[PDB]
Point group: C3
Chain length 215, copies 3
């Protein structure tokens, strides 16, 4: 179109189709902002990394926007089923896929390169006096990537797994949690020793993944 | 001002004006707008924060205008050091009510981001004669707990825990309370031995914390 | 240099110049300034980070210039996989010293944001014959634990936890160590059965993590 100067209300403005200032070699192009340097301006792109979300809405002649937010880092997986875990964890099945009983499956997608997932499993469990084993398995692996231990005296108790896992890409990954007795015994999740409801209601165990940037 | 044109600043031939209108812009640059290129011609893009980010513009002088990006404050911690005798029980009949156990803490928190969650962690040092411990988070204005967890003591003190995540509705400040009681059974001491004395003869510290996080759906 | 005006770039009637001064600006665009609209005329506004935000200008380049906005690295994880016999106890007499229990780990962390906290969690696999486990976190320099927690083992391995919040006061490296021992009596094994055998025949992993957060000051 045209270019020049014009009065807008009381403001004396320059106008043109586009602009090239300083060290720029072409006019402002897609997603570039005019950025000052020690000398003359450059055309710079704004970009997000490490858990930052950058949303450029570039398709409005009038109502364009750039929003800076946090990438969605948190994934919660409630587990409310009562599950009888008859699968034992033994010295011969611990480094296989066969130990314990799967009590949940969780699919997550990293949003940042070189990130970790902070994983918390907090599982309400009951067994006749003895040990509980919890194991986290990555689908495609041939053995658990994290292993933890809890305890029940007969009455329900919280049994926990805390770990961090290194993320190798930006695609969906499926994890499963398996629970079973240490070397022997039957373990109930979200129930009493006999499979009955704890305090006669539905109870809730939790698994969560918090994506964090590691040092 | 009120002028426009070209002028030499030191050796740099600069354009100058009260304001600028380029590309698809219908008006000159307005509040919080930057000039932003497209595959076509530029637009005026309003710059804004969301989801746990604050965007802050400081304009002290013509030569020191500032735009600060930073994290919104996400972490709320609530120490509990009192020794509380929890003679309130948790029972099949009081569990789905507000009367189970004994209240050991009250927590008011305010979400900074819409549709956020709170990662809640209650880590409570508790003692009782061999048996089970029950913990309940109650949201003020509910008829029953929003989270129930279980612990154990053999008679020596042991950490009892409640982990949950709660969906925030708005930016309204909200109060939660933590209740602790015997699993239908006996008496439970928090931050103390089963007889109510100090563990190791010192004051001990239980914790409740709320971490505001942005959830993926 | 020194040239300016309007030129045709393809079909685009463009203003060109070495630099630009608009609105409330009293000088042309200077280092890391952008042109920002106000409710008035525009200002030159420098972008800066704070509160756990990283902001870097790939600037001394005419080609591939950028401003990247990233989170500062907040997470620090410290796996402990060795079997450790803890023969030091915690007693009323030593609980406020540096002497209670056995040191099972040392961790140097460095806060990225001033006035932040570390959310600290220690999750330790421990066995001992029937009784109490005590966990104590110590800042190098201090004279006694800054945090104390309790666990339990019936004889079979059990997870023993410490969860706490530490207020960071500088941007300088700080060292913490974790100590574990029996409550008043007994031997406690970390990452092992009570006799020191590998649990389930394998190497096990205990974890100590520090997550930097920005606290709501209330
Ligand atoms: Na026991």
């Amino acid at each position: 179109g045209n270019s020049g100067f014009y009065l807008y209300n009381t403001e004396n403005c320059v106008f043109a189709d586009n602009i090239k200032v300083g060290q720029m070699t072409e006019p402002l192009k897609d997603q570039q902002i005019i950025l000052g340097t020690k000398s003359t301006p450059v055309a710079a792109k704004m970009t997000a990394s490490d858990g930052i979300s950058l949303t450029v809405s570039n398709n409005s002649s009038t109502n364009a926007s750039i929003t800076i937010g946090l990438l969605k880092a948190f994934n919660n997986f409630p587990i409310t089923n009562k599950i009888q875990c008859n699968g034992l964890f033994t010295p011969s099945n611990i480094e296989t896929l066969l130990g314990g009983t799967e009590i949940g499956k969780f699919t997550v997608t990293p949003k940042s390169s070189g990130s970790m997932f902070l994983v918390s499993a907090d599982i309400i469990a009951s067994r006749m006096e003895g040990g509980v084993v919890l194991a986290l398995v990555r689908e495609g692996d041939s053995k658990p990537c994290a292993i933890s231990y809890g305890y029940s005296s007969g009455v329900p108790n919280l049994c926990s797994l805390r770990t961090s896992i290194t993320n190798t890409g930006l695609t969906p990954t499926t994890y499963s949690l398996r629970v079973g007795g240490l070397e022997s015994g039957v373990v109930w999740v979200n129930a009493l020793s006999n499979g009955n409801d704890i305090l006669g209601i539905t109870n809730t165990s939790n698994v969560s993944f918090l994506e964090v940037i590691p040092q």
